[PDB]
Ligand SMILES: *[C@@H](CC(=O)OCC)[C@H](C[C@H]1CCNC1=O)NC(=O)[C@H](Cc1ccccc1)NC(=O)OC(C)(C)C
């Protein structure tokens with residue numbers, strides 16, 4: 001649990017930022033170059049607020065599987081000269097299960113906070129607020145609004161981005177290496 | 182940092198609870214027997230809500246130093262049959278300075294969340310919302326309301342209870358062994 005939090009702290013310091021769109025404030029992970037990721041429901045517009053600064057969104061790609069099913073991630077390319085430290089190395093080719101995970105959040109409401117969610121099991125299909133969604137990871141821990149975009153981690157692994165929950169169970173979209181080109 | 186979070190997680194699972202008084206929701210640490218502690222400004226009444234259950238407060242002791250100066254802690258004795266795991270062992274005789282601390286919070290707003298605040302230095306005197314207060318510990322990390330009562334920790338140490346902050350600096354009241362009889 002300790003090595004997981006250690007990795008997470010370092011990851012967030014190097015690769016995360018706080019973002020505001022018109023739909024809310026989110027944790028954002030930069031992945032490589034000028035590509036980052038948000039939960040789909042962040043619905044980023046042509047500009048976002050990134051650490052309180054206006055940044056133009058050159059592209060966004062709402063992710064779906066081969067059968068059009070929601071994956072609940074949006075990839076976004078930022079009109080930005082600074083490049084993100086390449087963390088593609090830490091993204092698995094398929095859905096990761098781990099015994100001890102940490103969820104890391106970094107917004108105004110939750111500034112640099114970490115939750116030990118423990119066991120993450122590949123959950124797969126879930127009806128998410130009416131929306132059939134695939135590739136979900138599930139953890140038991142009492143979830144809260146404004147945690148969407150939180151980064152799910154274990155030692156040496158970035159497992160996915162937090163997208164949903166109710167009460168005592170949360171879900172992340174798996175963050176798969178092949179989503180990045 | 183990892184061993185600190187590890188210790189904290191275990192400490193909170195064993196000794197913390199979520200409490201509501203008329204002045205808010207707080208993190209509460211049970212110390213020994215039926216004695217626990219809250220930040221002074223929690224102003225506990227004759228009953229409190231402890232994990233959603235009504236509990237009678239048999240005693241409360243607002244702590245001050247020999248010269249009457251506020252210490253910003255209230256000790257409270259709960260009308261309760263279950264006894265807290267004795268953690269007096271983990272409380273220093275004087276104000277602890279450490280290189281890596283974690284602040285642990287456990288309420289509805291922040292359920293089982295942990296913050297790496299890093300370096301804790303004995304700050305001592307501070308004018309806290311008009312109130313001259315002593316024995317303060319200071320850490321740099323961007324503080325937030327509803328974190329009061331959070332438990333400040335490092336490996337094998339319970340350093341104090343979070344009582345204040347603004348922006349980017351937070352303060353705990355040192356949790357000293359001799360406060361417990
Ligand atoms: C995070 C997103 C958000 O709107 O916060 C403001 C920045 C939130 C997860 C929270 C809410 C309570 N527990 C949590 O962990 N996500 C949602 O509320 C998502 C939003 C969504 C709706 C429909 C499709 C995709 C995403 N929905 C969600 O948890 O829905 C349930 C409760 C029906 C499962």
Ligand SMILES: *[C@@H](CC(=O)OCC)[C@H](C[C@H]1CCNC1=O)NC(=O)[C@H](Cc1ccccc1)NC(=O)OC(C)(C)C
Pocket residue numbers: 204205206207222253309310311312324325326327328329330344345346347348351
């Ligand atoms: C926690 C207590 C609270 O009222 O939350 C609701 C449960 C809060 C600390 C927060 C606020 C913003 N940053 C933080 O870390 N504590 C306070 O706001 C205390 C309350 C207090 C006032 C006067 C004497 C003693 C305690 N005050 C505080 O931070 O005051 C400043 C901002 C003037 C330093």
